[PDB]
Amino acid sequence: GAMDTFVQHIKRHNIVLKRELGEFGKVFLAECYNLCKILVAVKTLKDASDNARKDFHREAELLTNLQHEHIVKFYGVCVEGDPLIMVFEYMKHGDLNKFLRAHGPDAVLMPPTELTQSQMLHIAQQIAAGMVYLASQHFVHRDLATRNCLVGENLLVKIGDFGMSRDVYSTDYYRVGGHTMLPIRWMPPESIMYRKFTTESDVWSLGVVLWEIFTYGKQPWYQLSNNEVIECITQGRVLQRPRTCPQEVYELMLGCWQREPHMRKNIKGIHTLLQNLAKASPVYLDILG
């Protein structure tokens, strides 16, 4: 609503820091009171410059009205003293790549339950729903991947991360032109070669996210070196059809992988199809960790 345009400010004494999750600054697991106590994921900014604090408030103003069922919840900021604190919801089951791998055939064999095709479709439709929202707000993600998605209760999935992926998942990034760390395995030719990032390059990344889901979080093009990955993407070779993937879903992936950005399948059409397939194959079996 209209009131969401205005950033919510939170009192310092209402935030109880619990665990340092990692490391612009540190990330913590915390408890938040008088919000409605709840668990929260917080980002800190310690002794920053006037421009860096300006960037912090600018980011808060963007996040406050970027609200959707499938986007990680932003609760507000605390700017009383140092460090500056940005408050988000805590997604109980962590990053989606870790979740997918924890429910893979290897993890079962070594128990957890193997992720079903129905559960895969449920995860897929939720990410696509989040992407329809981001495209409607003219927001370009640039790093869509399962590592940058979160899992909550009842297999609820949302797009979100706390800026730790380039460290935690270092192998998923390549130093393009010897200057910028970029997720090449999730990128289309124009993004690798010309550094052009759009709604259409996010669609290509969504195709790769679908491949990840249906392969239990395996790294795309795992058989190849970084140079070989670029050669394949730019020449027109494609990722293999996952064993658990329905034919219509693989054809959807192929549509995300058109060389020409304006030839790629539209986000609304992708979501409608995934939503229809998920409803026809619903989730009902017990899931064990």
What are the Cα distances from residue 116, in Å, to 91, 151, 214, 273, 287? 21, 16, 9, 19, 10
Give 175's strand partners.
181
Q: What is the β-pairing status of strands 174-176 and 157-159? A: unpaired
* Measured distance CA(115)–CA(105) in Å, rounded: 8
Q: Which of 95, 143, 161, 202 is catalytic?
A: 143
For helices 267-280 and 199-214, the axis angle rounded to 10 degrees is 20
Distance between CA 123 and CA 149 in Å, rounded? 10
- Binding-site residue numbers for ATP are 21-27, 43
Q: Which residue in 251, 256, 254, 212 sits closest to 115, CA to CA?
A: 212
One-letter identity of residue 85? I
Q: Can you read off the two tokens belonging to residue 210?
A: 């679908």
Write the residues followed by a gap in the chain (C–N more than 2.5 A): 23, 36, 110
Sort 93 into a burial class: Cβ within 10 Å, 0-12 / 13-18 / 19+.
middle
The secondary structure element, H or E, covering residue 211 is helix 199-214
* Residue 205, H or E segment: helix 199-214
Instruction: Give the pairing of strands 15-22 and 74-78.
Output: unpaired
Instruction: Give the largest CA-CA distance in the chain.
Output: 56
Q: Is 161 a catalytic residue?
A: no
Q: Which CATH superfamily is domain 1-90 in?
A: Phosphorylase Kinase; domain 1 (3.30.200.20)
Given a contact cutoff of 8 angstroms between Cβ atoms, the answer to whether 85 and 17 are in contact is: no
Known binding-site positions: 21-27, 43
Cα distance between residue 95 and residue 150, in whole Å: 5
Distance (Å, whole) CA 45 – CA 84: 5
**Distance in angstroms (rounded) separating the CA atoms of residues 33 and 130:** 28
Domain chopping of the chain, boundaries: 1-90, 91-277
- Four-point Cα dihedral 188, 216, 122, 112, nearest 10: -160
Cβ neighbours of residue 10 closer than 8 Å, sequence gap 6 or more: 32, 35, 75, 76, 77, 78, 85, 87
- Domain 91-277 sits in which CATH superfamily? Transferase(Phosphotransferase) domain 1 (1.10.510.10)
Place of tokens 């957890």: 112
Q: Determined by which method?
A: X-ray
Element (H, E) at 80: none
Determine the Cα–Cα distance for residues 214 and 103; give it in Å rounded to an integer.
Answer: 11
The conformation of residue 226, written as its DSSP 8-state character, comes to H
Burial of 53 (0-12, 13-18, 19+ CB in 10 A): middle
Q: Report the 10 Å Cβ neighbour count for 2.
A: 6
Name the residue type at position 240: Q
Beta-carbon contacts of residue 143 (< 8 Å; ≥ 6 apart): 161, 165, 183, 186, 205
108 in Cβ contact with 99 (< 8 Å):
no
CA 62/CA 188 separation, integer angstroms:
27
The answer to whether the CB of 289 falls within 8 A of the CB of 157 is no
Q: Say if 1-90 and 91-277 have the same CATH topology.
A: no
Integer angstrom CA distances of residue 29 from 43, 80, 289: 9, 19, 21
Q: Where are the alpha helices (DSSP H) in 6-146?
A: 50-63, 96-102, 105-109, 117-136
The encoded tokens of residue 31 equal: 């408890």
Cis link prior to 188 (omega < 30° from 0)?
A: no
Element (H, E) at 212: helix 199-214
